[model samples]
Target: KIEEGKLVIWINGDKGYNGLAEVGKKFEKDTGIKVTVEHPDKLEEKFPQVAATGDGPDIIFWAHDRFGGYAQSGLLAEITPDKAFQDKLYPFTWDAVRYNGKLIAYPIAVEALSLIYNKDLLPNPPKTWEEIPALDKELKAKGKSALMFNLQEPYFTWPLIAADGGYAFKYAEDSSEMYKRVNKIIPHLIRQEKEDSETFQGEGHFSVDEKSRQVNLTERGLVLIEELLVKEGIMDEGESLYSPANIMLMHHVTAALRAHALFTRDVDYIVKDGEVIIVDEHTGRTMQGRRWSDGLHQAVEAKEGVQIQNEYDIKDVGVDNAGAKAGLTFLVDLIKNKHMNADTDYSIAEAAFNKGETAMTINGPWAWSNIDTSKVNYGVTVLPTFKGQPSKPFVGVLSAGINAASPNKELAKEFLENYLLTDEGLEAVNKDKPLGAVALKSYEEELAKDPRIAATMENAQKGEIMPNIPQMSAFWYAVRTAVINAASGRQTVDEALKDAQTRITK
Candidate 1:
């Protein structure tokens, strides 16, 4: 008979090994179980090979997205509610590890992204696409721009599109709404025709013909500012506000600003402030006075047709804080019932949501009760971790950077720590050597004791976690086609979503 006390596991060696080593020590001290840790260079490749033989580790340290694919393939062990350590987890943290009716993995760290621009350049970032172009024009007039791009821009644009109710792939049952949203922004561009027409129109002049062409909602939203720029004599008549070439210019301009303006030799951009900074991804070394040049700075000068000057304040053309009837009604009703101590059931929550009273239900099964309410506006699923389960449950709320459901990481930590006490909890705690939850609760507790753990978690939470879901990956090819088309102005969001729905449904 095999001894069941100690578990053997594998982890990637790419990051700080201390956290995993520490977690392993704690598990051994608390549970009297020894964990054997092996660091593999290619964890993704090895995990499936071992899983294929039904010999996958009792626990493994990897990102939730990679584990998600494994779980979907039935290679992962099922994490049951009965075995779950319900009390040791943050609800959001638990939700990040869930997939397709199973909680299959535990997380050591989480990563997230938020839209940030130079506060100096854009005093107020626009909440929607319509606001960006106008802001860009104002910056242009002041010898600045609202945004910029680089090799990372396409990847970054995914989040921007998502912020505007757009997506790069469909992953839900009813994708019609998503499709409509996508199509509203993207219309298949007649690339050759547009290039020819623009060439005929010459440089620095806006074409009346292009102006009259039916514009996608996003284009219309962006052009609102360009129209004003032309009228105001701030922008040239024949110049395209945005194009592939200009995007290259925009990226360089932003980099120059970040180096010369926001970041200092003593602070952020020091590693490459003046000439070039070497980024030590492992140590995250802060080098002083280094920055990228030519490719970035020159691009700005070339596009603007002026000396490369950096400091300027971008302005907003208009502002509107409109009210929403359905959303407001839903919240008011929900608050009223909760305060009144009414018999609030899932049905009630659903009814309220349907009526646009409150966003979602307060309770239900493992999946329903824990869904993050914030992401509902963006159509991402937020499944819950059940009352009892060994493995941590996670949900892939976003497909870029780190998986983030809400901006609230603190609430999630409390939920995870509480869930780690059950029998299944022991298994979860024992399986992964260097893993732990990131939540406000865990962060605070770690800070109160050893500040090192706290700092590690902070870095872990910011590092890259999710691999890009490619357009050709088996799990998302069709969905990607739909989402990309929508985001790139080839189709409406709703139409893209519908296409995704059709593909996933099959």
Candidate 2:
């Protein structure tokens, strides 16, 4: 109908643009009208302004949430689809596109949010708002939590408000009911917050701004307060007391209750061998060795007559040696002084580090390989200096020798001197299996391409290389035994080293 023989359409997102381009080409072939499709970054804000000036795209694709406002503002045209188009859509989808009784847009997709729960922990989901307290108690008894969500975001938060008869756009008649529902939910919300504080030791000094209604609390103070609270019985236990409730709690009552109601059993767990086993709904397999926390596992065990295992302390287990004795004494001192906890293993320590529960850990490059980079922003550095001395680790070098009696001795020498020594050869070797550090000085720049290799080289340069002497074999075992003895509190550091020296000399 236009003289320009072209029509413009605004779209956002890669998939949408690619799909539209294909359709545009097909349209151009059918009608000879060029379909120019563009992806606008701030399409929502810019589209309305441009349309008001009578200069805008023929089609503006966006979500249904803003379709009503756009139509009301006269920025959208009524799209009367043919009978064929009407028949292809679901009944509810048509309603989604209608604004004031006129279809102004097309519904291409539908998205919904649902609550997911653990069946092993929460057997029977709650049916009403009043059922949550009992459910929370049951969950807490089993070392688990009742419900959680993103309470701050309206997209997820609005459903909870709606369930309780609250609304953003309310009629005069429903205003009183909305206020009453909101008022009833507040006490429960406060109760949950108080419970959280008691469990998590949410203790901290705060300075309030009366005008702005803002409060500031020190991070370190909060941590100290929690520790104090646990000591004072204000909290049931230390940080682990509130660990089960890592999930978010909404409007507190309605949302929490709703979350419980939505989650189910069998789909979540399968009772096998008189024990409750959790199942991954997505993968449809049992989650092996995974247990629900906050007494939830114990509750399941209790319910099924399965023997509940008691928590055990992580006692330092090592052979009796001078080094071991000394180290154990120091660790026990730290525990007695309230400076550290002994309830840890390699897995526990690594998990804590990944989850941001602990600020530091002692690990090597192997541990870094499995780290979720998106979740954790980490950096690599040399271990802390002890007193004024740098910690030196044991370093070893790979060596090659050409057999004197071999017929290919000359060829082997040529390969080692020419191929293995060059940067190109080392680079090729690195591509297949990375060499931590090369012996050749000329290949330093080639090794520098990988930061891990460079760091390893730097650390190795500061380390003491193992001796190749025949007596060194006995020296290693002797020193190791002495270190263990000292760490186990059987002997002092000086006594351990003296014993090690005596054994090596003997």
Candidate 3:
């Protein structure tokens, strides 16, 4: 299976350098295939010219889906699938390589979107879009910003819109039905905008449009939770909760007190006086830019009380943002709590999860717990809809059967230590550790030292590794776009999904 001469490849210079090196090492080790990755500064210009001359790399690493026009221009080779390699790869990766049943590129990795939050902030994350506004109200009362979402970008709004059953474009058999469901969510979207509008104004703004709505919703949720705690006498009203700072700053960057606020280092990593420090997942060195995306970065800022940065408002850029920020403060007092030493205990929190019902949260001195479930009833909440997007309640389920292929050495090593080992309180000393701690002699010794943590680590490693099918990729892209649209007032859930289906089916 070894190729004799060097196999030529073309790649985008910016994000391809590291990828090429890693893949080059693997190709050489496995098949003695020498890969010469030709990185051109101007790929968009160079690729077309090279292809026009009927001369291009034997392989090209570009987005397979986004390169349809190039393929139509005859700039690619039809890589007929190899049975053995096909069987080993994830189905979604394979689909990404194929177009109309003709494969073009070999997939190296995939990016999937998920909700990541600061564990220290909201220990219990919101599972639905409807639960977020009340949290925003609480944050506003406490004089803190709420959340950070990319309202300026359409890509970020898709998920929320999809969850609400909206569609943007439709061409499938289910398009009609999906569109109907998406329309029903329009009112809910409007209601959220109205509820979160006031927080935007309190933060020195004047609108309840998309960007402000998302920021207020996220940042306010945390602040509201804190304010409720303060009212309950759990924490002081002057106690800081969250801020709206960009999370991309902890990169080999220094930590400083800004605007009389303190920012905390991620326990696993931190930025020192201009150099990135990694807390050895094994040794606890500051992990520099290794933190997860979204509010986690902002959460750190709020915890440390760094000068919270305001988002790039439209007016700042000379654009007239088209909404008023006056009435959104209605939820402020409803978000406060008044018992400092009260606890819902494990009993109330456990019951709500078990019964699959909604419960109003009560603040206590040390923790947030469930309140009286029977006395509280939640009403029918409506969400807005958009044309050309997926509809609401866009649920995605990830599952893999028992017989699926297990992870290779590299994959297992990366996830087990960071996710599994840490969860079990077992510190992995290095990346060279085995797949499961249960399979290691050091793990056994550690287990002997602490049986409780070992048992937890073992349990963590016992979960299923979900299989990736092409449908899942399509499903995820569809859902992500839909959710974003719904959360903001851009489109309804139905329209978002329809558009997602249209794009995916094409």
Candidate 4:
């Protein structure tokens, strides 16, 4: 009857055997008793037979469901937990293990079912059975369904059935009470029927034309789309709605509709510094100059208390001079000659360059910052000469000048020659403005250490310094007009050059 040095336990399932083995190890270490844990397949059938033969294990590990049967057969021992042990467990644990008003086993673990819903779709969960219909209606209107489970499974369905006062087993039940309970479940049955009916019945009835290869939507499919989308104003209706032309028209209108209906300022997008920027849904990134097209961009701008800009606007020519005109003329000539097609934007140009589709691209330092130099193996250089003439790029300068009417003009000049022209002076200046090149010849070697700075300096050496005079302001607009005229082929090179000279003179 007593084995002091040995303890044997039989575990039916694989669920908790590993944990039990760990516990057994600790118990064996403390008591110096050899603990044997065995997992028997078909344990339910083998256990009773083993117990009847008096060769049963000292303890059996199993689910609470089988405890009642084992206890009735006198196979299980009653467990009377002490107050300290009972205090640690939830109240449901005791009821789960009870068989004939006696605790049959220790409750190790319990599983519970819960409802999980999409927060975006269902902001608030239904609190009562009555609230379910309203929530179901809302989801249905959006062509969506809610609260799905395996309806044929008794494990899941039992809860729904029980909620309406239906019981699995009843020895003595009043007919009137059963009838009342049955009536309570009628509404749920009807709801399920509606859901099943909404399911696409003619899914396989779709036909495609052999010649055109165009798949045609069935009557039922068209009806469903009409009810769900067209009725809800999510889609537009027209005679040729299903045609490619109509679909393209609808696609064009969709963005405009969404801009007014769904996207909102300070929400989906934000107006920052008079610019409508899109906010990334997932990352909350502010995308600058990114717009939803097809009049939708204008619609969003209109909504944000700002004037709508042109849907298609030409890029502003920042540089405008004889050099700019010559460059644009060359570009146009190349395109006409089928040598290369000019990209409309920086992104397209960069993509073409990265894919090695294009040999070269014209971009500034900021563009090169994102370039993977390791993968590209690219070299930086100034823009190429046009028509045997060196390209004259605009150069901005930062210079220090002594006051001509200074009281100590001689002393100032001396100071400027000694300090400002020296390498030490350039180093001190660079400490404040780290970017751009220093004019000091002695500082060239140090500046050349950074390849980007060296490239910039080299490019600057080839550029024409932008005049600081006020007359240069008027020249910019004048030159820009001339370049546009020449580039667009609206006027001959000489004619545009003549116009630019006259405008500059004025």
- Winner by lDDT: 4
Per-residue lDDT of candidate 4, residues 308-398 (tens digit): 4432211112233344344445544543443433323446556645544433444444345455552554445443433444433334332
Q: Write the per-residue lDDT of candidate 3 for residues 239-332, one digit (tens) a residue.
A: 5543212111211011111101222354444646433233656553435333332223323333333322211111111000111011111111
* lDDT score for residue 121 of model 4: 53
Clashing pairs in 4: none
Candidate number that wins on TM-score, 1 or 4: 1
Clashes of 3: 109
Q: Is candidate 1 or candidate 3 better by lDDT?
A: 1
lDDT tens per residue, model 1, 1-506: 11244555555665434444555566667666665656777866886776666554555556666666666455655443343453444444444555433355554344332232333344344544334445545555675444332111223223322322222232232222222222222122122222224335322211223443322223333454445435544446665546432332233323333323222332322222223233424356655222233233322222223332221111100000011112112222322333211233334444443333332222112222222352232121111111111111112222111112112122222222333333333334334432332433534354324333343333233222333222214224554454355434466545654565455434
Off by over 4 Å in 3: 1-4, 16-19, 22-34, 168-506
Residue-by-residue lDDT tens digits, candidate 2, 329-405: 43334334433343444576566556554434444444565554525555443432322333333334432222112
C-alpha lDDT values of all predictions: 0.36, 0.43, 0.34, 0.45
Model 3: worst 10 consecutive residues (lDDT sum): 318-327
Q: How much is 342 displaced in model 4, in angstroms?
A: 62
TM-score of each: 0.39, 0.32, 0.36, 0.32
* C-alpha lDDT of candidate 4 relative to the true structure: 0.45
Error of 2 at 264 (Å): 93
